[PDB]
Nucleic acid binder design. Structure first.
Ligand SMILES: [Mg+2]
Ligand SMILES: [Mg+2]
Ligand SMILES: [Mg+2]
Ligand SMILES: [Mg+2]
Ligand SMILES: [Mg+2]
Ligand SMILES: [Mg+2]
Ligand SMILES: [Mg+2]
Ligand SMILES: [Mg+2]
Ligand SMILES: [Mg+2]
Ligand SMILES: [Mg+2]
Ligand SMILES: [Mg+2]
Ligand SMILES: [Mg+2]
Ligand SMILES: [Mg+2]
Ligand SMILES: [Mg+2]
Ligand SMILES: [Mg+2]
Ligand SMILES: [Mg+2]
Ligand SMILES: [Mg+2]
Lengths: 51, 147, 105, 187
RNA sequence: CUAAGGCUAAAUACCGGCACGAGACCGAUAGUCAACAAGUACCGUAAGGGAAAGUUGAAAAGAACUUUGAAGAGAGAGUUCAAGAGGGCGUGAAACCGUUAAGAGGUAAACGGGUGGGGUCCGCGCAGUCCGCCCGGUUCAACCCGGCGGCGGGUCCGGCCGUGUCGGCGGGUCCCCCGACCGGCGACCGGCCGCCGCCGGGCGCAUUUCCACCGCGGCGGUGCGCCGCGACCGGCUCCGGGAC
RNA sequence: GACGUCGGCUACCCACCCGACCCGUCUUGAAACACGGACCAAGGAGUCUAACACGUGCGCGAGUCGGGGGCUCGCACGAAAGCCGCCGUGGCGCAAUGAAGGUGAAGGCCGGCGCGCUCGCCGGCCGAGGUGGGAUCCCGAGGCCUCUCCAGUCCGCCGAGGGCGCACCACCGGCCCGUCUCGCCCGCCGCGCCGGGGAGGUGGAGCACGAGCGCACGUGUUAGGACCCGAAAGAUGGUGAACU
RNA sequence: GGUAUAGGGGCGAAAGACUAAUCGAACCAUCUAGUAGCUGGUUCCCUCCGAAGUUUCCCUCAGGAUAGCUGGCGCUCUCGC
RNA sequence: GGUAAGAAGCCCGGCUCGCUGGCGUGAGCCGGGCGUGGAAUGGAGUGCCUAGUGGGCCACUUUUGGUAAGCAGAACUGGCG
RNA sequence: GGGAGCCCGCCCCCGGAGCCCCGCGGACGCUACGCCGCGACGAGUAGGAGGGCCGCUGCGGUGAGCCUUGAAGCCUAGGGC
């Protein structure tokens, strides 16, 4: 498989010009990002009092 | 996919989206480009100026091979050679001035568009323009003519 | 009828073109048949090259290209005389020979 | 009975991306939370540009980004692009930059990493600068597509420089009666 | 280049003929006109025109026999899982027709909104008073011992794993070793701590857990149907007073 | 209130009050003494190919591509799928402007050489000009405070004010090709009916640090039978004087 | 009864009469699904927006092109923050 | 029926001009200082495709031809369509 | 941090302060293409757009799907959405 498609830092070596596609986003886990301290430090107090 | 097309939403409507006063007839205005001079003149004169009439000289047996002359600008001239050749420039303390052949890459005419980096070059081409030659001489290179 | 800036188009469909429509569903079968014929011909001449006779070096006319080098039809008689190969013998050993090609350079 | 026109009551602006890819949806959800919670308007602009279509976010060239970062004051700031960063071949010297983009070309990525710069994604931007502080937001030329050369005042109109829709340019295809002073008139 | 002389296979085409294979195609008013004795029946002097028409049953086991009738037709009997499949016989709709049951009927019939009366069955019920928690009036949780599995943690406790830089150039891009920092990132373990669950031993009875009742005691959604009353609020139509 | 009694909005029939002219179409105007229409069942009309334009989605990106061909399978799934010094012959795009011979996109600043002559020649420097509006980003005095007075690094919100200023718009400049006017000089292998340069107007589908290519979907305009049905006609080849 | 004259042809004491129930141009097949600015028809539901019979040109007046009226898709900004 | 009711406006300082001028003009470039410019109501600006329409009719008012017309023909506004 | 106030010290943690706010973890609410709260509005031919867990046929996957203890089709004064 590594000889057929290759990694991100290496060519396919069996396909003349082909590399693995790049990821649009790296940290795919949204839950970890949302509750990260860096984000939480820069958030307002939510308004969840139904009027 | 006919499923997603407009004809599925028009079921049950009498006129099928073509009006009930003016029906959908075969060719109310004519077939093709009919009437370029009469009754369709405004469209031709306000969207295709110069459609009617004849201008210029005729060329009976025209061959595209004779008039083949691809052009390359000085804006992208080092791209024809490998990057290591450009890296081996302003270096070696000799003034190497590597030779760039544009006929090898598929170009005959060299144009003067763009800014040339301060590095002597040897450019061999079928034809040269005045501005390109001026830029090459100012940078510190030389123009070579090849048949 | 024209309508608010479309291209002026002249389709060439005024004849009975539907009578002479050529489909290409035969393409894979044609390729398979060609491959089978090529393999059979290669097997028929067991030691000889499957491509065929050797082709000469030819430069292209029409200054557009003016620089590419391709395979010619056959070696000219002057080349055979210089190399020392009889024109009638050469075709029996796998050398392409044609008598129309001149020799300027 | 109230006399109010209803023809301009429904606003046409996009609310969600039309694409069905899931990574863009995840980024959209993250920036929805960031924009609806944080008072920063940078998140609002990023959300709106994420909702946009392909033609509304034209690619940004490397040379244009370098020139924009060359302006005084915006030194050591992260480039934020909602389009695609494309390599520019008619430029030689590339400085070190911090760039954030949905897509980076292989040539552009290699040249940026060679010069010592950093390439980040929007989820990394949220972790690094959740409020988008110290960032320069850039975009490609919106009018760069060839369609706009055909838009505007119609051809065959006085003081108009609009490219007409012609099958092929040549001597005997146009530039005749309607464009020649010798043939009828010209505009 | 050498016309007014000549020959030559291959790569090419193939809605006819012979023999095969396949289908995101149609399924008897479709698909070829023709799924069947179809270019047939039939029409025109002729050139020509040209249909309709598939289905019992697994197996004919295709209804012996008795009876009325001249017979066509019936009534019995018999076959079959089924003739409530009986030789144009699988399933058998609508238009239309006969009969039976009910309702109604002098402004043609029919239609929309609102009720009433009568039928059709449906869902109860021989009260349906509906439950679900907490409280009062045969063994194990609490607490210990052993085993098993799991969770989280950091001195990163040790190694692997793993990202960026620095070191050995040791083998433009692709690999090896130790050491340091940092992201130690859910990429894995071996021990430590705390916790959880299960099993086996104790723990014999003011704790523990099932069944049934008298409490309608506290809470929640409800009542089988017909209802009535009280207070509070919101929006209206009025009435009686006093005071400027 | 509960063995001939309950609930059943909708549907079965009937009655009453109010409303209520037969649908489709041409039409300013239809219930019309305008046209089509006995009733029922089945079939029945915006399709496909090609060329464009715009919008949308995807991949790559100054590149993009698979046309055709070739290598792997004897075809179950397959006439698929995978691959190519064919990865690009070639198309599209990256350069335009003239009928053409042809030409063909950068300037500015600094010091010097001719008289700085808004003109020519030498070395260095900055490398798509400037103005106005410009989403966002940077600095930011100071304020809001904090259980008492002072000092006080820190986590904050507002933050007058001051800037770098995306994309885009409007304007002023600059450059490229054709053309017009006024002009002064440069070079040579061949000193000429040679070639090159300047300033000022104007014409171009241009440049002024790019955005296209391929696939798919939708809409609109066409060529095709072209949403379906409908002529009075024209042409080619055949058959008839059994009526007259 | 036999025979001859065949379709822009025949034949006609002449009516445009007859030429197989058709004759001011027979019948059969094909081109051909000929063309129609002209009639007729054009098949499920709900939601939202919602017109014109007007200017100019056309051998144009029962029709088109073009402006106008309409819808859809957006984008650039401001803000009861 | 047009305009004006301010920031795209005013007040100063200095440069450029192959234009015009006795000195002067006039225009264009840079630097600096001054903000609610009548009432009341609205969030605005901008770009692409785009179907149908192109037989109209009626009414208050003004009005042309006609004896008049449920006649023919115009203007504003409102309706039916 | 120091100096102090209308004799010194404490002024403690939610695995527990027990709550109208708990910044220590957080739905019965989270098919985030989901859920929830505010206001205004609701005509429509020609025409345009959107949503159909509306309907038909066939193909790739998926329901350890249904079915001779009964599939499709058809009829129904039965129960409903
Ligand atoms: Mg070959
Ligand atoms: Mg048939
Ligand atoms: Mg039957
Ligand atoms: Mg009509
Ligand atoms: Mg009429
Ligand atoms: Mg009607
Ligand atoms: Mg009738
Ligand atoms: Mg039907
Ligand atoms: Mg169009
Ligand atoms: Mg016809
Ligand atoms: Mg004719
Ligand atoms: Mg006569
Ligand atoms: Mg037709
Ligand atoms: Mg007409
Ligand atoms: Mg709307
Ligand atoms: Mg409306
Ligand atoms: Mg109408």
């Amino acid at each position: 498989l590594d000889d057929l498609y290759g990694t991100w830092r290496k060519a396919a070596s069996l396909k003349s010009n082909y590399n693995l596609p790049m990821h649009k986003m790296l940290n795919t886990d949204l839950s970890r990002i949302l509750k990260s301290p860096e984000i939480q430090r820069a958030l307002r107090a939510p308004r969840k009092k139904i009027h | 996919p006919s499923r997603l097309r407009k004809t599925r939403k028009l079921r049950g409507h009498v006129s099928h989206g073509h009006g009930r006063i003016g029906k959908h007839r075969k060719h109310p205005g004519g077939r093709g480009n009919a009437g370029g001079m009469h009754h369709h003149r405004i469209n031709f004169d306000k969207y295709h100026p110069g459609y009617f009439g004849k201008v210029g000289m005729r060329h009976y047996h025209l061959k595209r091979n004779q008039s083949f002359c691809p052009t390359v600008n000085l804006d992208k001239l080092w791209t024809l050679v490998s990057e290591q050749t450009r890296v081996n420039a302003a270096k070696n303390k000799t003034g190497a001035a590597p030779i760039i052949d544009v006929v090898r890459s598929g170009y005959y005419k060299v144009l003067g568009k763009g800014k040339l980096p301060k590095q002597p070059v040897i450019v061999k081409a079928k034809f040269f323009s005045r501005r390109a030659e001026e830029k090459i001489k100012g940078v510190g290179g030389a123009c070579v003519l090849v048949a | 009828a024209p309508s608010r800036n479309g291209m002026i188009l002249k389709p060439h469909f005024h004849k009975d073109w539907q009578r002479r429509v050529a489909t290409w569903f035969n393409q894979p079968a044609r390729k398979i048949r060609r491959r089978k014929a090529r393999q059979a011909r290669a097997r028929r001449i067991a030691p000889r090259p499957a491509s065929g006779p050797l082709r000469p070096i030819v430069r292209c006319p029409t200054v557009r290209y003016h620089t590419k080098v391709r395979a010619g039809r056959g070696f000219s008689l002057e080349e055979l005389r210089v190399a020392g190969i009889h024109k009638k013998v050469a075709r029996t050993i796998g050398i392409s020979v044609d008598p129309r090609r001149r020799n300027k350079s | 009975g109230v006399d109010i026109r209803h023809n301009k009551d429904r606003k046409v602006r996009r609310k969600e991306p039309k694409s069905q890819d899931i990574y863009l949806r995840l980024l959209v959800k993250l920036y929805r939370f960031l924009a609806r919670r944080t008072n920063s308007t940078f998140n609002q602009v990023v959300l709106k540009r994420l909702f946009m279509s392909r033609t509304n976010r034209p690619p940004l060239s490397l040379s244009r980004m370098i020139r924009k970062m060359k302006l005084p004051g915006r030194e050591g700031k992260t480039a934020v692009v909602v389009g695609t960063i494309t390599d520019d071949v008619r430029v030689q010297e590339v400085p070190k930059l911090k760039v954030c983009a949905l897509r980076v070309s292989s040539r552009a990525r290699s040249r940026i990493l060679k010069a010592g710069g950093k390439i980040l994604t929007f989820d990394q931007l949220a972790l690094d600068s959740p409020k988008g502080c110290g960032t320069v937001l850039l975009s490609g030329p919106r009018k760069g597509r060839e369609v706009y050369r055909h838009f505007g005042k119609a051809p065959g109109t006085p003081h108009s420089h609009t490219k007409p829709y012609v099958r092929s340019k040549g001597r005997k295809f146009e530039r005749a009666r309607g464009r020649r002073a010798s043939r009828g008139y010209k505009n």
